[PDB]
RNA sequence: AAGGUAAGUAU
């Protein structure tokens, strides 16, 4: 109920601890025409599953700096090669370099690059925004448009869903089967009713 | 035993020959299509705000019909008569088939222009998917026409008479994001335009596809507003669709009344059109009563408007009638009967 | 209702009261019983009832 | 991306109708030489639904140059360049009498691949100055530029 | 060492106690302003 | 007046679509500074709309009459 | 002001934060620069190296507006400097204070 | 944290400097005689 | 007692698998198509080319001197009255909805709808009443008409 | 041990 992503009705919790999922919470049953069949997640009598830890999916600073150096050297080489051909770099050329580097390579393909080139001293502004906006910024040290999104979390969500038993395992804890929806594919939520 | 929270059903106990095989699919069908179970499912869905159907877009209904009469440019795209065939029932019991030329309706309720694109039968040769090809051709013609017209004549809204053409128009107008295409719950009588002889003979006599421009407001804007012209035309089309033969006789009360060669509708004075519209409305109401076994006197003004428009007051099904009883508290429940158990 | 509350969860109890308003539980039981009655009526001769 | 940058510093068509005591006013329609221009703004909301819809056009209504151009450009906008290249190659394969599809294939194809695309275009659609000028621009070498213009002439 | 391309020292990193206290106070502020806050908003503030 | 207030405060297609969140379609985080924030069905698969919804000009920002006088 | 200052290099590289690196990156660069100094880890002849980290206490509260304005005349127009310094001389309100 | 020449690093005890918004991080590098002289100068004013 | 083997359904890992499959298919198509695409003196001098062009110009100057079988009709055969003909049009269906095209008369469908509404307003092999919910009067054309 | 009372009207 806590660590299910909000898309499936959970809270979308991120975990920095060691939380075990009991094996009694990985079992579900569905009714077929011939009868009712019971299923379980994590078979072969494995040990109790663990929700993924947030640390395993964050690349450390030192490795990320090494990757940034390598990726930007590679981009410089590719750019010089494309100049010799009078060709513009395509998104496929900078594909292995995607989501790598500080700033991120995908910042080169942003639609605001022309106007962000005149944004000077933005990092001190982000740190000085605490004296203008009452809310406290946990990302005071970076700007998403300039440095890029230095973290990716889709792998963490995939591992969380896999650990929880997938859609079948997660949705058994819910009132999904009480709705008698034929499948979970075409459904969508409504964050606020008309009233 | 029935699990309402998980929609699981089972049965334990003795069985006589044939009881279990019957009761298996009996319980399966009961679980699939029970009215009260459906009420529970819908209540849970509404409480959860979980939806399955594609999100509902603005639709031309009987409520926002008044909003249609604005100063902006609107188009009415009808693809009902794109792929059109004609069948005749012979007295021998055999029935024959002969495909005929089709048409595409692009109606402008503001200026009365009717862009008719004749679809010759040659395009259907060697085509497996007739409906898909017809819809894509209609969307292509709509886009071609809207590119032909200048910007100030470009519509701000394209109302589609049939639900299936929303996607082809949506994807074929990617270059015009500022143009909103809408569906219509009510079925406008734009398919009855070809019932008029001047359109039917023209389309049948045509040998190659061509774009034809008409004017359904021939001599009307000189005396009435386009809001009244559209309502009169929609009444005429509804009468033509509902009863073509009687409507033609109504449109010509006397042999003196004549139509100019360049005007589709008879040239009647402003006062005569009032009586003609009253007669057409009486036709529509009487035929609706005949088809539904109801009296025209008891129909309210809103019901009359819905009948004239394409809004369909469909009778609730037997399943839907049971759902309404379960969904609502018993009406004036009277505990007049006592049972001892 | 046939729902057992294992604790005072008013957030859940309030929304469970709406779902089973207008005696929905009784109506579901009655409808299922009636449907089985028609099912067994349709098979009187085959089942020797 | 602009090569100056460093680490720190469309469903078109072909037919337009001619809008100019007769009830009938036929509108003679003319053909379009160019199938619009590659200036799509990525206005696709549902990407997969638009992908499915454009796929049906390429099947139900083949030999329609805008249909292949629109699908190729939609694939290009979403970032799948190679799928767009394959789609435009198929469009050139089965809509080979139109300049627009061939010059869109030349635009999408990278490097020497576009040279063979232009060669196939001129083989199937000769006497097309638009394709020859594109080949001249595509070919960097001045001697080879002269050779291409010579073959065009 | 850049010139000799060899390792010469090791920086042992550690989270400053002031940042620890800042995060703990942020969590305390999130928890205190939760009388009327929904579960989704609380978990979103936690995640952020 | 009531029509104009209904047009202003009324739900807009851009906001109607942003209130819808797909079931089982785990999206990607688009705002570092505030998690949980999402565009919903705006520019995402499963929205059912090929073309993007246009901006309603009735919701455009405008300044007060007294503020306009001061300006 | 920031665009012009970056354009003509008003702030030397030691001024932080810098637009080219997050604070962890400048910490890493600081450690590497410490490691890359000549004979930084040698102590055979009694040589010692000391790390001093501190703050300018009451930096903002002790800024004199006259001196700040006169120092701003040196880098910007006298009209811009006067605007920036007069902007700091405003009434501060909190409820009824 | 760069210098034109290696000899320019040793011209002053201060070898590295970095000012944050208000924090200052300064790294000196003394020899034995320089440290001894500085300590003597300090203890002259503030004996312990 | 013992649950049977169940594969965990991961909605967003399946998307990654689909993307990888699409990339592999695109790469295979590129490799296959490059084979069909990679198969393809006067180039260095201009006077010879102009001589050839003039020769070709001289050469050109010298040379100057009904059947709709299988289409379902969603109407009963008895619905059609002898002595008159009537028009059928295609029933509206979604483009992506893969289904057979059926021929429909608007007036006949209006009549059938009115009949159904009249029947429902007066009615107030197993489990027939709800068989319509889970799950039609059409005939197949052959060599034109039937 | 609690933070787990439906508020009733009738008999």
UniProtKB/Swiss-Prot annotation, chain D:
Superkingdom as given in the UniProt entry:
Eukaryota
PTM description: Phosphorylated by PRP4K during spliceosome assembly.
Enumerate the subcellular locations listed in this protein's record, separating them with semicolons.
Nucleus, Nucleoplasm; Nucleus speckle
Q: Which residues carry this modification: Phosphothreonine?
A: 22, 31
Q: Which residues carry this modification: Phosphoserine?
A: 35
What tissue expression does the UniProt record report for this protein?
Answer: Widely expressed.
Q: Describe the disease involvement stated in the record for this chain.
A: Retinitis pigmentosa 60: A retinal dystrophy belonging to the group of pigmentary retinopathies. Retinitis pigmentosa is characterized by retinal pigment deposits visible on fundus examination and primary loss of rod photoreceptor cells followed by secondary loss of cone photoreceptors. Patients typically have night vision blindness and loss of midperipheral visual field. As their condition progresses, they lose their far peripheral visual field and eventually central vision as well.
Function in brief = Involved in pre-mRNA splicing as component of the U4/U6-U5 tri-snRNP complex, one of the building blocks of the spliceosome. Enhances dihydrotestosterone-induced transactivation activity of AR, as well as dexamethasone-induced transactivation activity of NR3C1, but does not affect estrogen-induced transactivation.
Question: What name does this protein carry?
Answer: Pre-mRNA-processing factor 6
Q: Give the lineage.
A: Eukaryota, Metazoa, Chordata, Craniata, Vertebrata
Q: What gene does this protein come from?
A: PRPF6
List the range of the whole protein covered here.
200 to 397 of 941
Swiss-Prot record, chain G:
Transmembrane segment boundaries: none
Q: Where in the cell is it found?
A: Nucleus; Nucleus speckle
What is known about the tissue distribution of this protein?
Widely expressed.
**What free text does the record give on domains?**
The MPN (JAB/Mov34) domain mediates interaction with TSSC4 and SNRNP200. Has structural similarity with deubiquitinating enzymes, but lacks the residues that would bind the catalytic metal ion. Contains a region with structural similarity to reverse transcriptase, presenting the classical thumb, fingers and palm architecture, but lacks enzyme activity, since the essential metal-binding residues are not conserved.
Pathology noted in the record is: Retinitis pigmentosa 13: A retinal dystrophy belonging to the group of pigmentary retinopathies. Retinitis pigmentosa is characterized by retinal pigment deposits visible on fundus examination and primary loss of rod photoreceptor cells followed by secondary loss of cone photoreceptors. Patients typically have night vision blindness and loss of midperipheral visual field. As their condition progresses, they lose their far peripheral visual field and eventually central vision as well.
Under which name does UniProt file this protein?
A: Pre-mRNA-processing-splicing factor 8
What is the species of this protein? Homo sapiens
Whole-protein residues included: 926 to 1022 of 2335
UniProtKB/Swiss-Prot annotation, chain H:
Q: Where in the cell is it found?
A: Nucleus; Nucleus speckle
Q: What's the domain of life for this entry?
A: Eukaryota
Tissue expression profile of the protein: Widely expressed.
What does the UniProt entry state concerning the protein's domains?
The MPN (JAB/Mov34) domain mediates interaction with TSSC4 and SNRNP200. Has structural similarity with deubiquitinating enzymes, but lacks the residues that would bind the catalytic metal ion.
What does the subunit section of this Swiss-Prot or TrEMBL entry state? Part of the U5 snRNP complex. Component of the U4/U6-U5 tri-snRNP complex composed of the U4, U6 and U5 snRNAs and at least PRPF3, PRPF4, PRPF6, PRPF8, PRPF31, SNRNP200, TXNL4A, SNRNP40, DDX23, CD2BP2, PPIH, SNU13, EFTUD2, SART1 and USP39. Component of the U5.U4atac/U6atac snRNP complexes in U12-dependent spliceosomes. Within the minor spliceosome, which acts on U12-type introns, interacts with PPIL2 and RBM48. Core component of U2-type precatalytic, catalytic and postcatalytic spliceosomal complexes. Found in a mRNA splicing-dependent exon junction complex (EJC) with SRRM1.
Q: List the protein's name.
A: Pre-mRNA-processing-splicing factor 8
Q: What is the lineage of its organism?
A: Eukaryota, Metazoa, Chordata, Craniata, Vertebrata
Q: Gene that codes for this?
A: PRPF8
Curated annotation (Swiss-Prot), chain I:
**Which species does this protein come from?**
Homo sapiens
Cite the source lineage: Eukaryota, Metazoa, Chordata, Craniata, Vertebrata
Purpose of the protein: Plays a role in mRNA splicing as a component of the U4/U6-U5 tri-snRNP, one of the building blocks of the spliceosome. May also bind to DNA.
According to its UniProt record, which protein family does this protein belong to?
Answer: Belongs to the SNU66/SART1 family.
Q: Where in the cell is it found?
A: Nucleus
**Subunit note:** Identified in the spliceosome C complex. Component of the U4/U6-U5 tri-snRNP complex composed of the U4, U6 and U5 snRNAs and at least PRPF3, PRPF4, PRPF6, PRPF8, PRPF31, SNRNP200, TXNL4A, SNRNP40, DDX23, CD2BP2, PPIH, SNU13, EFTUD2, SART1 and USP39. Interacts with UBL5. Interacts with IVNS1ABP (via Kelch repeats).
How this protein is processed and modified after translation, per its record?
Sumoylated with SUMO2.
Q: In which tissues is it expressed?
A: Ubiquitously expressed.
Name the UniProt record assigns to this protein: U4/U6.U5 tri-snRNP-associated protein 1
Q: Mind telling me where the Glycyl lysine isopeptide (Lys-Gly) (interchain with G-Cter in SUMO2) cross-link is? A: 91, 128, 135
Coiled-coil ranges (or none): 10-65
List residues modified as Phosphoserine: 138
